[PDB]
């Protein structure tokens, strides 16, 4: 019993530490959306003749 008690508390910090990592990671993704991917196309003359 006290063998498995020590590993259980030692794995509940890692479960809570890996949760905090995703909340900081997917608030950076929420800023990445925008015009990060807009200045990637190398076809700029046809996409201004189409809109005009």
């Amino acid at each position: 019993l006290p063998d498995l008690h020590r590993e259980l508390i030692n794995s509940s910090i890692r479960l809570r530490y890996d949760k905090y990592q995703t909340r900081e990671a997917q608030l950076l993704e929420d800023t990445k959306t925008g015009r990060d991917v807009a200045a990637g196309v190398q076809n700029p003359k046809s996409i201004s003749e189409y809109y005009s």
């Binding site: 196309v41 076809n43 046809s46 996409i47 003749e49 189409y50």
Partner: protein, 49 residues
């Protein structure tokens, strides 16, 4: 899908050139009706030849 934008452009050049054609036709019907209304005015004055 926005990479090419090539074979989607001349099918808007087509429908835009027909609309500028249909404008110039009906702008010509409103210029021959205004010829009929210049003759019927002058003829019903009383002076024919």
């Amino acid at each position: 899908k926005l990479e090419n934008l090539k074979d989607k452009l001349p099918d808007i050049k087509s429908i835009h050139s027909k609309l500028l054609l249909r404008i110039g036709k009906l702008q010509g019907l409103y210029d021959s009706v205004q010829v009929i209304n210049r003759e019927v005015e002058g003829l019903s004055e009383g002076r024919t030849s």
